[PDB]
Amino acid sequence: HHTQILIVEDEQNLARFLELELTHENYNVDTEYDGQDGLDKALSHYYDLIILDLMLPSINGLEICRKIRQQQSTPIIIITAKSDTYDKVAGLDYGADDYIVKPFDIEELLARIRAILRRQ
């Protein structure tokens, strides 16, 4: 019984870093670097929480978020270099549970994962 996380992120250094840091916290992690592959994975497997970058190949994160939310209430955290207030609001209103501006400290992401999953 492991908590399952999907990361959709096209910057492969950060993607691997997040995978390693989350695996160290005893999460099971799947990663996708392409937006369509990430959506397809999110819809075909059960995750406990999904981490979504916004600028991705094929389709971008807000479309992924919308299409996941047509099917699932699965927690979503958006991570992105997009830091304007409107981008944050739009992402939360499309159903993301949190929204973190890059670059961030891993310990903050881990704390926010814990806080969201506490209420599941």
Q: Which is nearer to ligand BEF, 32 or 53 (CB)?
A: 53
Percentages helix, strand, coil for the chain (3-state, rounded to 5) are 45, 20, 35
Q: How far is the CB of 55 from ligand BEF (least distance, A)?
A: 3
Size of the site for ligand BEF (CB under 6 A): 7
Q: Which is nearer to a second copy, 32 or 98 (CB)?
A: 98
Q: Is residue 89 at the binding interface for Mg ion, with CB under 5 A as the rule?
A: no
Where along the sequence are the contacts to Mg ion (CB under 5 A)? 10, 53, 55
Chain residues binding ligand BEF by CB under 6 A are 53-55, 80-82, 102
